[PDB]
From a paper:
Archaeal DNA polymerases from the B-family (polB) have found essential applications in biotechnology. Variants of the archaeal polymerase from Thermococcus gorgonarius, TgoT, that can either generate HNA from DNA (TgoT_6G12) or DNA from HNA (TgoT_RT521) have been previously identified. In this study, six X-ray structures of DNA and HNA polymerases are reported: (i) three apo- structures of TgoT, TgoT_6G12, and TgoT_RT521-; (ii) two DNA-bound structures of TgoT_6G12 in binary and ternary complexes; and (iii) one DNA-bound structure of TgoT_6G12, which has incorporated two HNA nucleotides. Consistent with all other DNAPs from B-family, TgoT and its variants fold into five distinct structural subdomains.
To better understand how the mutations added on TgoT variants impact the structure of the polymerase, the X-ray structures of the apo form of TgoT, replicative polymerase TgoT_6G12, and reverse transcriptase TgoT_RT521 were solved by crystallography. Crystals were obtained for the three polymerases and diffracted at 2.4, 3.1, and 2.35 Å, respectively. The helices α19 and α20 are part of these regions. Hence, overall, the crystal structure of the wild-type TgoT appears more stable than the two variants studied here. Nevertheless, both structures are in the known and expected “open” conformation. The presence of this antechamber, which is reminiscent of a storage pocket, was actually observed in two other structures, namely the apo-structure of TgoT and the binary structure of TgoT_6G12, all grown in an excess of ddNTP.
Residue numbers in the entry: 1 to 610, 612 to 664, 676 to 709, 713 to 757
The structure:
């Protein structure tokens, strides 16, 4: 299988390198005959002789057009004849493209900024990560000596840990009596020892957590300080550092540097992205953090080195475990988009769609439009208006069904052939007109994007069938990832239409999809109201909550199934309405804010106060109010609960344990008290404090709370904690803040 591609320059000529892993053997293939090229649209074919003589300079050397050939391509559905201009080296293109564009007879130039190694994969039809080759992986982490006020990598590397199927080990230059610790004489010997393990193990994948912006940079500066050739690459190279906007990225030639940090940053949403928080969210198991001060103290005193070595071992162990969990998904994403795992794991949704489109465009002889210039880019940042949101019916409702469209936006794009190449195509015999906006889309031929989107949905179904039929659990997980990634790619096309940097950007397409979506949801609502007697309580973009106010639970379910059969027969093409849940009770506060409860008595919420500055009394009272309303149907009881809680708080009857806040006023006051005890100020959600009557404008750690010495601030927990947490819920029922505080 293909791992990656790149190029080196030898005597001014580019040489493509294909890094492969075939039958348990690493291989490098070379291609010295791939010519870089760009396209040029001319007003007259006679002008080609003027374009051939256009020259520029790279580094003293004169860059010129090697040869040209006239080709026939499609450009936004219309046939076009352009000149394919060949060059000696890919770096000739940035040097001459402006001089060719500025030529009067040149209407425009195309495909002039496509990286050579990526252009090779597309043009040769090569797909990375394809096949059943098993890759060898190795995770690693480092521990450093930190001092506040010193330059980057001023202190030495204390330990280097690594982990794989054989387990986790720690290399260090101090005596540690642990079975998994290997002891060397110096920091230099430790780094050299790590090089030998990577060389002997010869892993295809090097797994790190934030290795792009820390680990590799630290190792690089230390190896320069110690005079070590840090040869991690399979061809004898040192790790290559690249610039990715405001941050960095590291390649290790011949292998795949898989940095888990950007991957997990996109996949899951967490308050903090420390290695400890991430591991605990994915595996549900705890991981203790050992801070830089504790590491430095242990190394200088020589006391407690077992604890630091165990932490270093766990870092490598959990990084290998997380790498085993996220790599197969990224390998499937690489197969899907057609680019290396290295690029795919570090790219955004917009870039992933573009690279998929660029490959498909080449396959279909479709000339790709250019990226927007700075002027055009500013023109594409205009406001938006898409998605219907109904203002909800106020009050408590019973026996509610939730109905929604299956893939509304992709269905619209396919059904109505929405594409920049079908938009207002003159002489069209058949067309669909977008409501309100009035954009017409030709139906005479399949549009580029709807055609690909249709093939994606067909491929997804073929993948789902294979998944359900395969007994092999590893293959089932792989098919599951591919299937899920196809769904995500299909649901990225709408957003891509309105994506300012997109080559195939089309605001008319984007507005048309939302206008059609507004029409389908609004027509379905009036249909269920007029012909089935349902009341639509709330609706947002592709679904709605409905009920028959005086009907029982089985009656509402039956009528909903009958409505689905009715409207699905009327819906065109791929559009389909679905039954996605029944709820015993529910209330809809405002747009995007509501709460509902299923038959299993499970409360589902959206748009509630549930920030980091919150106590167990505020969380408990909100749950109690929600339960009284949704489970008992008693809104007056929910009010009495708040009145009871505020009265108990004012009379000091609430236990202090329910007043602890876990995390500017209280926070800075508690920070001073914690720093006074030797505890360093570190970013973490571990601060547990309680607010006292401080008579200032007051916070102490909960461990030090004593009822005989301290009295909590009842007014603070009423006005800043309990009331704000329940206020939005009870304001929907007509109650003000003052109607609850006794």
């Amino acid at each position: 299988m293909i791992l990656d591609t790149d190029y080196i320059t030898e005597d001014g000529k580019p040489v493509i390198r294909i890094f492969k892993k075939e039958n348990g053997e690493f291989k490098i293939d070379y291609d010295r005959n791939f010519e870089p090229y760009i396209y040029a649209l001319l007003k007259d074919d006679s002008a080609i002789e003027d374009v051939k003589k256009i020259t520029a300079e790279r580094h003293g050397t004169t860059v010129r057009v090697v040869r040209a050939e006239k080709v026939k391509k499609k450009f936004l559905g219309r046939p076009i004849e352009v000149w394919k201009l060949y060059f000696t080296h890919p770096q000739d293109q940035p040097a001459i493209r402006d001089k060719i564009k500025e030529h009067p007879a040149v209407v425009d130039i195309y495909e002039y900024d496509i990286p050579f190694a990526k252009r090779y994969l597309i043009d040769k039809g090569l797909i990375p990560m394809e096949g059943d080759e098993e890759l060898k992986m190795l995770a690693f982490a480092i521990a450093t000596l930190y001092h506040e006020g010193e330059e980057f990598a001023e202190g030495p590397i204390l330990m280097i840990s690594y982990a794989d199927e054989e387990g986790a080990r720690v290399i260090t230059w101090k005596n540690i009596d642990l079975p998994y610790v290997d002891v060397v004489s110096t920091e230099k010997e430790m780094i050299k020892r790590f090089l030998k393990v990577v060389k002997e193990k010869d892993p295809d994948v090097l797994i790190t957590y934030n290795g792009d912006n820390f680990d590799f940079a630290y190792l690089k500066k230390r190896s320069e300080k110690l005079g070590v050739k840090f040869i991690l690459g399979r061809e004898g190279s040192e790790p290559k550092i690249q610039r990715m906007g405001d941050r960095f990225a590291v390649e290790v030639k011949g292998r795949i540097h898989f940095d888990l940090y950007p991957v997990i940053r996109r996949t899951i949403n967490l308050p903090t992205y420390t290695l400890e928080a991430v591991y605990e969210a994915i595996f549900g198991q705890p991981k203790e953090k050992v801070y830089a001060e504790e590491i430095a103290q242990a190394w200088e005193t020589g006391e407690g080195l077992e604890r630091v070595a165990r932490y270093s071992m766990e870092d490598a162990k959990v990084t290998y475990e997380l790498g085993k969990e996220f790599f197969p998904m990224e390998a499937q994403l690489s197969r899907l988009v057609g680019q290396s795992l290295w690029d795919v794991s570090r790219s955004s949704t917009g870039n992933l769609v573009e690279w998929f489109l660029l490959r498909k465009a080449y396959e279909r002889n479709e000339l790709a439009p250019n990226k927007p210039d700075e002027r055009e880019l500013a023109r594409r940042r205009e406001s938006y208006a898409g998605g219907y949101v109904k203002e909800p019916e106020r009050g408590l409702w019973e026996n509610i069904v939730y109905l929604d469209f299956r893939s509304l936006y992709p269905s619209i794009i396919i059904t109505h052939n929405v594409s920049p190449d079908t938009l207002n195509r003159e002489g069209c015999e058949e067309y669909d007109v977008a409501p309100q906006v009035g954009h017409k889309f030709c139906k005479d031929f399949p549009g580029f994007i709807p055609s690909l989107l249709g093939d994606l949905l067909e491929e997804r179904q073929k993948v789902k069938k294979k998944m359900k039929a395969t007994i092999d659990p590893i293959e089932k997980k792989l098919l599951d990832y591919r299937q899920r990634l196809i769904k995500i790619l299909a649901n990225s096309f709408y957003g891509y239409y309105g994506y300012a940097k997109a080559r195939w950007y089309c605001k008319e397409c984007a507005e048309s999809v939302t206008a059609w979506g507004r029409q389908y949801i609004e027509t379905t609502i009036r249909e269920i109201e007029e012909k089935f007697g349902f009341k639509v309580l709330y609706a947002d973009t592709d679904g709605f909550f409905a009920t028959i106010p005086g009907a029982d639970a089985e009656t509402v379910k039956k009528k909903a199934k009958e409505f689905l059969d009715y409207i699905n027969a009327k819906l065109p093409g791929l559009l389909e309405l679905e039954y996605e849940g029944f709820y015993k009770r529910g209330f809809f506060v405002t747009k995007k804010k509501y709460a509902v409860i299923d038959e299993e008595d499970k409360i589902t919420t959206r748009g509630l106060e549930i920030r980091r500055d919150w106590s167990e009394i505020a969380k408990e009272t909100q749950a109690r109010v929600l339960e009284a309303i949704l489970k008992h149907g008693d809104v007056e009881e929910a009010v009495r609960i708040v009145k009871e809680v505020t009265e108990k708080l004012s009379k000091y009857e609430v236990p202090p344990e329910k007043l602890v806040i876990y995390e500017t006023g209280p926070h800075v006051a508690v920070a001073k008290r914690l720093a006074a005890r030797g505890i360093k100020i570190r970013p973490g959600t571990v601060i547990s404090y309680i607010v006292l009557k401080g008579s200032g404008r007051r916070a102490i750690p909960f461990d030090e709370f004593d009822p005989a010495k301290h009295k909590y601030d009842a007014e603070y927990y009423i006005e800043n904690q309990v009331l704000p947490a329940v206020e939005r819920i009870l304001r929907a029922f007509g109650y003000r803040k003052e109607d609850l505080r006794y």
